[PDB]
């Protein structure tokens, strides 16, 4: 086995491009945080908890991806 | 400010301008767009208008 040896690599590289999802999505729905108490110092408590909820659903393209590289890696 | 038709009292009423709009601890609450220069217009319509109601 070589031919189907090297393929593990190269797909394992693409694997990580999916990881953009998390990058530049997580940074939105935290950025929303931001400019709202900024806006409303009063309502903390209420806005602060469903945060971080929107970053479990946005973790979710960056775990999958993720593991996707290494069942190229250390799987297979 | 005429309490009667026999009687006057003399009235104070303090008219708040621009710089004091933004330190206003409620004004989250209403949505405003920092572009139109919203406080700005309102002092110098405000001072007008508690002016006529002083003098009518």
Sequence with gaps: ?76 | DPVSSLSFEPSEKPIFNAKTIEQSPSFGKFEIDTDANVPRDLFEYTLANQMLTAMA
């Design chain 1, 1 to 76: 086995m070589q031919l189907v040896l090297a393929a593990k690599y190269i797909g394992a590289g693409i694997s990580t491009i999916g990881l953009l999802g998390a990058g530049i999505g997580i940074a939105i729905v935290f950025a929303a945080l931001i400019n709202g108490v900024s806006r409303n110092p009063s309502i903390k408590d209420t806005v602060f908890p469903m945060a971080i909820l929107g970053f479990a659903l946005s973790e979710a393209t960056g775990l999958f991806c993720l593991m996707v590289s290494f069942l190229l890696l250390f799987g297979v």
